[PDB]
Coordinates of C-alpha atoms and ligand atoms in Angstrom, one line a residue:
Chain H
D3 CA -0.1 0.0 -0.2
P4 CA 2.5 2.9 -1.2
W5 CA 0.1 5.9 0.0
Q6 CA 0.0 4.1 3.6
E7 CA 4.0 4.2 4.0
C8 CA 3.6 7.9 2.4
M9 CA 1.1 8.7 5.1
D10 CA 3.3 6.6 7.9
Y11 CA 6.3 8.9 7.1
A12 CA 4.6 12.0 7.3
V13 CA 3.0 11.3 10.4
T14 CA 6.4 11.2 12.1
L15 CA 7.4 14.0 10.0
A16 CA 4.4 16.2 11.6
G17 CA 5.5 14.9 14.9
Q18 CA 8.9 16.2 14.6
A19 CA 7.6 19.3 13.2
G20 CA 5.2 20.0 16.2
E21 CA 8.5 19.4 18.4
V22 CA 10.2 22.5 16.6
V23 CA 7.0 24.5 17.3
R24 CA 6.9 24.1 20.9
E25 CA 10.3 24.9 21.5
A26 CA 10.3 27.9 19.4
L27 CA 7.2 28.9 21.2
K28 CA 9.5 29.3 24.6
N29 CA 11.8 31.8 22.4
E30 CA 12.3 35.4 21.0
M31 CA 10.5 35.5 17.8
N32 CA 11.0 37.5 14.3
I33 CA 7.6 38.5 13.2
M34 CA 7.3 39.5 9.7
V35 CA 4.4 40.9 7.8
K36 CA 3.2 39.2 4.3
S37 CA -0.4 40.6 2.8
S38 CA -2.0 42.8 5.9
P39 CA -1.1 43.7 9.0
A40 CA -2.7 41.0 10.3
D41 CA -1.1 38.1 8.1
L42 CA 2.1 37.0 10.1
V43 CA 4.6 35.0 9.0
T44 CA 7.9 33.9 11.7
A45 CA 11.1 32.5 10.9
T46 CA 10.0 29.0 12.8
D47 CA 6.8 29.2 9.6
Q48 CA 9.8 29.2 7.1
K49 CA 12.0 26.7 9.0
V50 CA 9.3 24.1 9.4
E51 CA 8.3 24.1 5.8
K52 CA 12.1 23.6 4.6
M53 CA 12.5 21.0 6.8
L54 CA 9.1 19.1 5.6
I55 CA 9.6 19.9 2.1
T56 CA 13.2 18.7 1.7
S57 CA 12.6 15.6 3.7
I58 CA 9.8 14.6 1.5
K59 CA 11.0 15.6 -1.8
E60 CA 14.4 13.6 -0.7
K61 CA 12.0 10.6 -0.2
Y62 CA 10.0 10.9 -3.2
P63 CA 11.4 13.0 -5.8
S64 CA 9.0 12.3 -8.5
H65 CA 6.2 14.0 -6.4
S66 CA 4.8 17.6 -6.5
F67 CA 4.6 20.3 -3.6
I68 CA 2.4 23.3 -2.7
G69 CA 3.7 25.0 0.6
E70 CA 2.3 28.5 2.0
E71 CA 5.8 29.6 2.6
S72 CA 7.0 28.1 -0.4
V73 CA 4.4 30.0 -2.5
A74 CA 5.2 33.1 -0.8
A75 CA 8.8 32.9 -1.5
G76 CA 7.8 32.4 -5.2
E77 CA 6.7 28.9 -5.8
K78 CA 4.0 28.4 -8.2
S79 CA 0.8 27.4 -6.8
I80 CA -0.4 24.5 -9.3
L81 CA -2.4 21.5 -8.8
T82 CA -1.8 18.7 -11.5
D83 CA -3.1 15.2 -11.1
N84 CA 0.4 14.3 -10.1
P85 CA 0.8 13.2 -6.0
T86 CA 0.9 16.4 -4.5
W87 CA 2.0 17.2 -1.0
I88 CA 0.1 20.9 0.2
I89 CA 1.7 22.0 3.4
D90 CA 1.2 24.6 6.2
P91 CA 3.9 24.4 8.2
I92 CA 2.2 26.4 11.3
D93 CA -1.8 27.1 10.5
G94 CA -2.4 29.9 13.1
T95 CA 0.5 31.9 13.1
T96 CA -1.4 34.3 15.0
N97 CA -1.9 32.2 17.7
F98 CA 1.8 30.9 17.9
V99 CA 2.7 34.6 18.0
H100 CA 0.7 34.6 21.4
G101 CA 0.7 31.0 22.4
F102 CA -3.2 30.7 22.1
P103 CA -3.2 27.2 22.2
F104 CA -4.3 26.0 18.7
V105 CA -1.3 25.9 16.7
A106 CA -1.3 23.3 13.7
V107 CA 0.9 21.5 11.2
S108 CA -1.0 20.6 8.3
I109 CA -0.1 17.9 5.8
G110 CA -2.3 17.2 2.8
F111 CA -1.5 14.4 0.1
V112 CA -3.6 14.8 -3.2
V113 CA -3.8 12.3 -6.0
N114 CA -5.6 13.0 -9.1
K115 CA -6.7 16.1 -7.4
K116 CA -8.7 14.1 -4.9
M117 CA -7.7 14.3 -1.4
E118 CA -5.8 11.0 -0.6
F119 CA -4.5 11.3 3.4
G120 CA -4.4 14.5 5.6
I121 CA -2.4 14.9 8.8
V122 CA -3.2 17.7 11.4
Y123 CA -1.3 18.1 14.0
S124 CA -2.6 20.1 17.3
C125 CA 1.1 20.9 18.5
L126 CA 0.4 22.4 21.8
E127 CA -2.8 19.9 22.5
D128 CA -0.6 17.2 21.5
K129 CA -3.7 15.8 19.3
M130 CA -2.7 14.1 16.2
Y131 CA -5.5 14.0 13.8
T132 CA -5.9 11.7 10.4
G133 CA -7.8 10.7 7.8
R134 CA -7.4 8.7 4.7
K135 CA -9.8 7.9 1.8
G136 CA -11.4 4.6 2.5
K137 CA -9.5 4.2 6.1
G138 CA -11.7 6.4 8.3
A139 CA -10.7 9.4 10.4
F140 CA -8.8 9.3 14.0
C141 CA -7.5 11.4 16.9
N142 CA -4.8 9.6 18.8
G143 CA -6.1 6.4 17.7
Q144 CA -9.8 7.2 18.4
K145 CA -12.3 6.8 15.4
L146 CA -14.1 10.3 14.9
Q147 CA -17.6 10.7 13.9
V148 CA -19.6 14.4 12.7
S149 CA -22.4 15.1 14.8
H150 CA -26.2 15.3 12.9
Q151 CA -28.2 18.2 13.4
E152 CA -30.1 18.9 10.0
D153 CA -31.9 21.9 11.6
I154 CA -29.7 25.0 11.1
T155 CA -31.6 27.2 14.0
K156 CA -30.1 24.5 16.7
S157 CA -26.5 24.6 15.3
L158 CA -23.1 25.9 16.5
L159 CA -21.3 26.9 13.5
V160 CA -17.5 27.6 13.3
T161 CA -16.0 30.8 11.3
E162 CA -13.2 33.4 11.1
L163 CA -13.2 37.0 10.9
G164 CA -9.9 36.7 8.1
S165 CA -6.5 38.5 7.8
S166 CA -8.3 41.2 5.8
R167 CA -8.6 44.9 7.4
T168 CA -10.0 46.2 4.1
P169 CA -13.3 47.9 5.4
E170 CA -15.6 46.9 2.9
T171 CA -14.3 43.1 3.1
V172 CA -15.0 43.0 7.1
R173 CA -18.2 44.8 6.4
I174 CA -19.3 41.4 4.4
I175 CA -17.8 39.1 6.7
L176 CA -19.6 40.8 9.8
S177 CA -22.9 40.9 7.6
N178 CA -22.7 37.1 7.1
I179 CA -22.1 36.3 10.7
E180 CA -25.1 38.8 11.4
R181 CA -27.5 37.2 9.1
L182 CA -26.8 33.5 10.2
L183 CA -26.7 34.6 14.0
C184 CA -30.0 36.3 13.7
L185 CA -31.6 32.8 11.8
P186 CA -31.2 32.4 14.9
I187 CA -28.2 29.9 15.9
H188 CA -27.0 28.6 18.9
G189 CA -23.6 30.5 18.6
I190 CA -20.5 30.9 16.3
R191 CA -17.0 29.8 17.2
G192 CA -13.9 29.6 16.0
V193 CA -10.1 28.7 17.2
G194 CA -8.1 30.8 14.8
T195 CA -6.9 28.1 12.6
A196 CA -9.1 26.4 9.5
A197 CA -7.6 22.9 9.9
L198 CA -8.2 22.7 13.6
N199 CA -11.8 24.2 13.0
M200 CA -12.4 21.9 10.2
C201 CA -11.2 19.2 12.8
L202 CA -14.0 20.3 15.4
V203 CA -16.4 19.7 13.1
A204 CA -14.8 16.1 12.4
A205 CA -14.9 15.2 16.1
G206 CA -18.5 16.4 16.0
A207 CA -17.9 19.5 18.6
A208 CA -19.5 21.6 16.2
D209 CA -21.9 21.3 13.3
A210 CA -20.4 23.2 10.3
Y211 CA -17.4 25.5 9.3
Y212 CA -17.2 28.0 6.5
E213 CA -14.9 30.4 5.4
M214 CA -13.8 33.0 2.2
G215 CA -10.1 33.9 2.1
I216 CA -8.5 30.5 2.9
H217 CA -6.3 28.6 0.6
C218 CA -5.7 25.1 -0.5
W219 CA -3.2 24.4 2.2
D220 CA -5.5 25.7 5.0
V221 CA -8.1 23.4 4.4
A222 CA -6.3 20.2 2.3
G223 CA -5.4 18.0 5.2
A224 CA -8.4 18.7 7.3
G225 CA -10.8 18.1 4.1
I226 CA -10.4 14.4 4.1
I227 CA -10.5 14.2 7.6
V228 CA -14.1 15.8 7.8
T229 CA -15.4 13.9 5.2
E230 CA -14.0 10.6 6.6
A231 CA -15.7 11.4 9.3
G232 CA -19.0 11.4 7.5
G233 CA -19.2 15.4 6.9
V234 CA -19.4 17.0 3.2
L235 CA -17.4 19.6 1.7
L236 CA -19.3 22.4 -0.4
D237 CA -18.4 25.7 -2.2
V238 CA -20.1 28.7 -1.0
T239 CA -22.0 28.6 -4.1
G240 CA -23.9 25.2 -3.7
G241 CA -21.8 23.8 -6.0
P242 CA -19.0 21.1 -5.8
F243 CA -16.3 21.9 -3.3
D244 CA -13.0 23.4 -5.3
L245 CA -10.0 23.3 -3.3
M246 CA -8.0 26.1 -5.3
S247 CA -11.1 28.5 -5.1
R248 CA -10.3 30.2 -1.8
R249 CA -13.7 29.1 -0.3
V250 CA -15.4 26.2 2.0
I251 CA -18.0 25.0 3.6
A252 CA -17.2 21.6 5.8
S253 CA -20.4 20.4 7.4
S254 CA -21.3 17.5 9.1
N255 CA -24.5 17.2 6.4
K256 CA -25.8 18.3 3.4
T257 CA -29.2 20.2 4.6
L258 CA -27.3 22.2 6.9
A259 CA -24.5 23.3 3.9
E260 CA -26.9 24.2 1.8
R261 CA -28.7 26.3 3.7
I262 CA -25.6 28.3 4.7
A263 CA -24.5 28.5 1.3
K264 CA -27.9 30.3 0.6
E265 CA -27.4 32.7 3.6
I266 CA -23.4 34.1 2.5
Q267 CA -22.7 36.7 0.6
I268 CA -19.4 36.0 -1.4
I269 CA -16.3 38.3 -1.4
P270 CA -14.1 38.6 -4.4
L271 CA -10.9 36.5 -4.3
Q272 CA -7.8 35.6 -6.6
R273 CA -7.8 31.7 -6.8
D274 CA -4.9 29.7 -6.1
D275 CA -4.7 28.8 -9.7
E276 CA -4.7 31.7 -11.2
Chain Z
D3 CA -6.5 29.6 57.7
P4 CA -10.4 29.7 57.3
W5 CA -10.8 30.4 53.8
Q6 CA -7.9 28.0 52.5
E7 CA -10.0 25.2 54.0
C8 CA -12.9 26.7 52.0
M9 CA -10.7 26.9 48.9
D10 CA -9.6 23.3 49.2
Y11 CA -13.2 21.8 49.8
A12 CA -14.3 23.5 47.0
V13 CA -11.9 22.5 44.5
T14 CA -12.6 18.7 45.6
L15 CA -16.5 19.6 44.7
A16 CA -15.5 21.2 41.6
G17 CA -13.8 17.8 40.8
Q18 CA -17.2 15.8 41.5
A19 CA -19.2 18.7 39.4
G20 CA -17.1 18.0 36.8
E21 CA -17.4 14.6 36.6
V22 CA -21.1 14.5 36.4
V23 CA -20.9 16.8 33.6
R24 CA -19.0 14.4 31.4
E25 CA -21.3 11.6 32.5
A26 CA -23.9 13.8 31.3
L27 CA -22.4 14.4 27.7
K28 CA -23.0 11.0 27.0
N29 CA -26.7 10.7 27.8
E30 CA -29.6 12.5 26.1
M31 CA -30.3 16.2 27.0
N32 CA -33.6 17.9 28.0
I33 CA -32.7 21.6 26.2
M34 CA -34.9 24.4 27.6
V35 CA -34.5 28.2 27.0
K36 CA -34.1 30.8 29.4
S37 CA -33.5 35.1 28.3
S38 CA -33.6 34.5 24.5
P39 CA -33.8 31.7 21.9
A40 CA -29.9 31.2 22.4
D41 CA -29.7 31.0 26.2
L42 CA -29.6 27.7 27.0
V43 CA -30.1 25.3 30.2
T44 CA -30.4 21.6 31.0
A45 CA -31.2 19.5 33.9
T46 CA -27.8 19.0 34.2
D47 CA -27.2 22.5 35.1
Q48 CA -29.4 22.5 37.4
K49 CA -28.5 19.3 39.1
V50 CA -25.0 20.4 39.6
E51 CA -26.1 23.6 41.1
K52 CA -28.2 22.1 43.7
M53 CA -25.5 19.8 44.7
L54 CA -23.1 22.5 44.7
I55 CA -25.1 24.6 47.1
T56 CA -26.7 21.9 49.1
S57 CA -23.0 20.7 49.8
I58 CA -21.5 24.1 50.6
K59 CA -24.0 25.3 52.5
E60 CA -23.8 22.3 54.8
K61 CA -20.0 22.9 55.8
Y62 CA -20.6 26.6 56.1
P63 CA -24.6 27.1 57.2
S64 CA -23.5 31.0 57.8
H65 CA -22.5 31.6 54.2
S66 CA -24.1 33.3 51.5
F67 CA -25.1 31.8 47.8
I68 CA -25.7 33.3 44.2
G69 CA -25.9 30.7 42.1
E70 CA -27.0 31.2 38.1
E71 CA -29.8 28.8 38.0
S72 CA -30.9 29.6 41.7
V73 CA -31.3 33.1 40.3
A74 CA -33.2 32.0 37.3
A75 CA -35.8 30.0 39.7
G76 CA -36.3 33.4 41.5
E77 CA -33.7 33.9 44.1
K78 CA -32.2 37.3 44.5
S79 CA -28.5 37.9 43.4
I80 CA -27.7 40.6 46.5
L81 CA -24.0 40.8 47.5
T82 CA -23.4 41.6 50.9
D83 CA -19.9 41.5 53.0
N84 CA -21.1 38.0 54.4
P85 CA -19.0 35.4 52.7
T86 CA -20.7 34.8 49.7
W87 CA -20.5 31.8 47.1
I88 CA -21.1 32.7 43.3
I89 CA -21.7 29.5 41.4
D90 CA -21.7 28.5 37.2
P91 CA -22.8 25.4 37.3
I92 CA -21.9 24.9 34.0
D93 CA -20.3 28.0 31.8
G94 CA -20.9 27.0 28.5
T95 CA -24.2 25.2 28.5
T96 CA -24.0 25.8 24.3
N97 CA -20.7 24.4 24.6
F98 CA -22.0 21.2 26.7
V99 CA -24.7 20.6 24.3
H100 CA -22.7 20.2 21.2
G101 CA -20.1 18.8 23.0
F102 CA -17.7 21.7 22.1
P103 CA -14.7 21.0 24.8
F104 CA -14.7 24.2 26.8
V105 CA -17.1 23.7 29.6
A106 CA -16.4 25.0 33.1
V107 CA -17.4 24.2 36.5
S108 CA -17.1 28.2 38.2
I109 CA -17.0 28.8 41.9
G110 CA -16.1 32.4 43.0
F111 CA -15.7 33.2 46.5
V112 CA -16.3 37.0 47.7
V113 CA -16.0 38.5 51.3
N114 CA -16.7 42.2 51.9
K115 CA -17.5 42.4 48.2
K116 CA -14.0 41.7 47.3
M117 CA -12.7 38.4 45.2
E118 CA -10.9 36.1 47.5
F119 CA -10.5 33.3 45.7
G120 CA -11.7 31.2 42.4
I121 CA -12.2 28.0 41.1
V122 CA -12.5 27.5 37.1
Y123 CA -12.7 23.5 36.3
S124 CA -12.3 23.0 32.6
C125 CA -14.2 19.5 32.6
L126 CA -13.4 18.4 29.1
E127 CA -9.6 19.3 29.4
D128 CA -8.9 18.3 32.7
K129 CA -7.5 21.6 33.9
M130 CA -8.0 22.8 37.1
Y131 CA -7.6 26.9 37.2
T132 CA -7.3 28.0 41.0
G133 CA -6.4 31.7 42.2
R134 CA -6.6 33.2 45.9
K135 CA -5.8 36.5 46.8
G136 CA -2.0 36.7 48.3
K137 CA -1.3 33.3 46.6
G138 CA -1.0 33.0 43.2
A139 CA -2.9 31.4 40.3
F140 CA -2.3 28.0 39.1
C141 CA -3.4 25.7 36.6
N142 CA -2.8 22.4 37.6
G143 CA -0.1 22.9 40.0
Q144 CA 1.6 25.1 37.4
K145 CA 2.1 29.5 38.2
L146 CA 0.3 31.5 35.8
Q147 CA 1.5 34.6 34.6
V148 CA 0.0 36.9 32.0
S149 CA 1.5 38.3 28.8
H150 CA 3.0 41.7 28.2
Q151 CA 1.8 43.5 25.2
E152 CA 0.8 46.9 25.6
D153 CA 0.6 48.0 22.1
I154 CA -3.4 47.1 21.0
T155 CA -2.3 46.7 17.1
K156 CA -0.4 44.0 18.1
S157 CA -2.7 42.3 20.3
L158 CA -4.8 39.2 20.5
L159 CA -8.1 40.1 21.9
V160 CA -11.2 37.7 23.2
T161 CA -15.1 38.1 23.3
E162 CA -18.3 36.2 22.5
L163 CA -21.2 37.1 20.3
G164 CA -23.7 36.9 22.9
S165 CA -27.0 35.1 23.8
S166 CA -29.2 37.9 22.8
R167 CA -30.7 37.5 19.3
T168 CA -32.7 41.1 19.1
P169 CA -31.1 42.9 15.9
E170 CA -30.4 45.9 17.6
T171 CA -28.5 44.3 20.1
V172 CA -26.1 42.3 17.9
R173 CA -25.9 45.1 15.6
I174 CA -23.8 47.0 18.5
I175 CA -21.8 44.1 19.5
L176 CA -20.7 43.5 16.1
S177 CA -19.7 47.2 15.5
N178 CA -17.7 46.8 18.6
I179 CA -15.8 44.0 16.9
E180 CA -15.8 46.0 13.8
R181 CA -14.1 49.0 15.7
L182 CA -11.8 46.9 17.1
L183 CA -10.5 44.7 14.1
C184 CA -9.8 47.7 12.1
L185 CA -7.7 49.6 14.7
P186 CA -6.0 46.9 13.5
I187 CA -5.4 44.2 15.8
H188 CA -3.9 40.5 15.5
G189 CA -7.3 39.3 15.8
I190 CA -10.5 38.1 18.0
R191 CA -10.7 34.8 19.5
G192 CA -13.2 33.1 22.0
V193 CA -13.8 29.6 23.2
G194 CA -17.7 30.1 24.4
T195 CA -17.2 30.6 27.8
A196 CA -16.6 33.8 29.8
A197 CA -14.7 31.7 32.5
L198 CA -12.4 30.1 30.2
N199 CA -11.7 33.0 27.9
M200 CA -10.7 34.6 31.5
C201 CA -8.5 31.7 32.3
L202 CA -6.6 31.9 28.8
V203 CA -6.1 35.6 29.4
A204 CA -4.5 34.7 33.0
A205 CA -2.0 32.1 31.3
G206 CA -0.8 34.8 29.0
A207 CA -2.8 32.9 25.8
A208 CA -4.1 36.2 25.1
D209 CA -4.0 39.8 25.7
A210 CA -7.1 40.9 26.9
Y211 CA -10.9 39.9 27.4
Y212 CA -14.3 41.9 27.4
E213 CA -17.6 41.4 27.3
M214 CA -21.0 43.0 28.0
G215 CA -24.1 40.8 28.9
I216 CA -22.5 38.6 31.0
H217 CA -23.2 37.8 34.8
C218 CA -21.7 37.9 38.6
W219 CA -21.3 34.2 37.8
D220 CA -19.8 34.5 34.7
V221 CA -16.6 35.9 36.1
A222 CA -16.1 35.7 39.7
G223 CA -14.2 32.5 39.9
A224 CA -11.9 33.9 36.8
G225 CA -11.8 37.3 38.0
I226 CA -8.9 36.6 40.9
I227 CA -6.9 34.3 38.5
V228 CA -6.5 36.9 36.0
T229 CA -5.2 39.6 38.7
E230 CA -3.1 36.7 40.5
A231 CA -1.7 35.9 37.2
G232 CA -0.5 39.7 37.3
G233 CA -3.6 41.2 35.2
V234 CA -6.2 43.7 35.8
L235 CA -9.8 43.8 35.7
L236 CA -11.9 47.3 34.5
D237 CA -15.1 48.3 33.9
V238 CA -15.8 49.4 30.3
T239 CA -16.3 52.6 31.3
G240 CA -13.0 52.9 32.5
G241 CA -13.6 52.9 36.4
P242 CA -13.0 50.2 38.6
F243 CA -14.4 46.8 38.0
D244 CA -18.0 46.4 39.0
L245 CA -18.9 42.4 39.7
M246 CA -22.6 43.1 39.7
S247 CA -22.7 45.8 36.6
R248 CA -22.9 43.2 33.2
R249 CA -19.9 44.4 32.0
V250 CA -16.1 43.3 32.1
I251 CA -12.7 44.0 30.8
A252 CA -9.9 41.5 31.8
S253 CA -6.5 42.5 30.7
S254 CA -2.9 41.6 31.2
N255 CA -2.2 45.1 31.6
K256 CA -4.0 49.2 32.2
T257 CA -2.5 50.2 29.1
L258 CA -4.8 47.8 26.6
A259 CA -7.7 47.9 29.1
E260 CA -8.0 51.5 29.1
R261 CA -7.7 51.5 25.0
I262 CA -10.7 49.0 25.3
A263 CA -12.9 51.1 27.0
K264 CA -12.0 54.3 25.0
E265 CA -13.2 52.1 22.0
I266 CA -16.5 50.5 22.5
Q267 CA -19.8 51.5 22.7
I268 CA -21.8 50.2 25.8
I269 CA -24.8 48.2 25.7
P270 CA -27.9 49.0 28.2
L271 CA -28.1 46.0 30.3
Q272 CA -30.1 45.0 33.5
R273 CA -27.5 45.0 36.5
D274 CA -27.4 42.0 38.9
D275 CA -28.0 44.2 41.9
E276 CA -31.0 45.9 40.3
Ligands
MG1 MG1 0.3 32.5 7.0
MG2 MG1 0.6 28.6 7.9
MG3 MG1 -3.1 28.0 7.3
MG4 MG1 -26.9 29.9 31.4
MG5 MG1 -23.9 28.8 33.5
MG6 MG1 -21.8 31.0 32.5

């Protein structure tokens, strides 16, 4: 089972990356700015990504890579049918900078443009989330299952305010939150990382997650965990989920997903493939 | 040391209450609503409260009690100088109903209308947060310390959307978030409970917490944990913290607290002592 060997190797690697992250948390940081004042990167993000990609590439030199900080350093963000590793070295950089205890290493493996396996390591909780097509979803060995609430007025939803600080954009995000909150729903949550918000849905701790402004690396590892736990992915348009589209609804079921799509106003964004 | 004997006993009872909450997560729930369609209560909330008060009262029958569900049943919430136990049997009922893993038992002990000790047990995490005036703040025996960021534009703030579903109320809460978000700040977080949001600030995982709409039982146990970890409490008016006012800023430092107070709009609220 070649993909299982890939996965086993990558789980070990994610563990090693999380040790690096924990040690760095206790040292002084170099906090740099990317696309907005709220879009942060540290030297640890960059170091961990280099560690991960150079290791995996050395072992699997014919595979392809899409990494967040690699793309920031000029690599192209193209998804082909070739086995592709989609890496977020630190999902929740802002959390890392503050010691907010939801910081993930995320690794997605994609073949024929379909998610095959995903690894999301919650570094500060020591929780290893895994999933693989046809194999189940787990947290530290415990099988994961989504909840089953088809009534949005009894749902607990998850989302984030995003790194944008452009007033028009922030206004639509908050207007989407206002619309949903007043349907009414039970509440909105978030822990400040897309991967771990999705893992909370996978585990049955909330009913659905949505966000616009994410990238393929934020969601590729957690997407298969959600679906192997029994959930569904959709685009915010109602159509099929598209990994390169910057948009996601990750839901325990289709009824909830389709309803959320109906209430959300779409923001404009640069696709990861343009 | 009389109050230490009170505290040691109450930590044992908090542990017992947390085991009751964890066993209830398993079984069917009776979900009732209180002050709004999103203000939930279960039989477990009511059970735990009665367990706590009957037990503490037998040991300390001259002391006073203020409990969330007792007040909901018609009891008064009068704070006198008499040693007073202020109890939130389950802080985060919505989280409890959904399995969102931040659910707390909160006990505050107040003497001469001053916080003396506080106990906040994170049930699903097995994290016992404690604090006593002149003794320090701890999580499972490890001393807590707030972080030190005096620049709000580099801050991570914590808050919640509230249980109100009244449009005019939700509009101000979201406007306050918009104002803060665009200062700009690094982000807003929350885990869906006042007491655990405050314990995250105590532990240095976020820079400050604010909310309007809370009650004395939401904050009495965590308040002393925040101040013994080196933080400060303030009213949103900039004045001293008032436990019965339905308003709180719990901050690592005074500079951030005062800036938050300057930026947000107050919502009118029925006091706990009116
Ligand atoms: Mg980033
Ligand atoms: Mg990242
Ligand atoms: Mg990310
Ligand atoms: Mg309540
Ligand atoms: Mg409560
Ligand atoms: Mg409460």
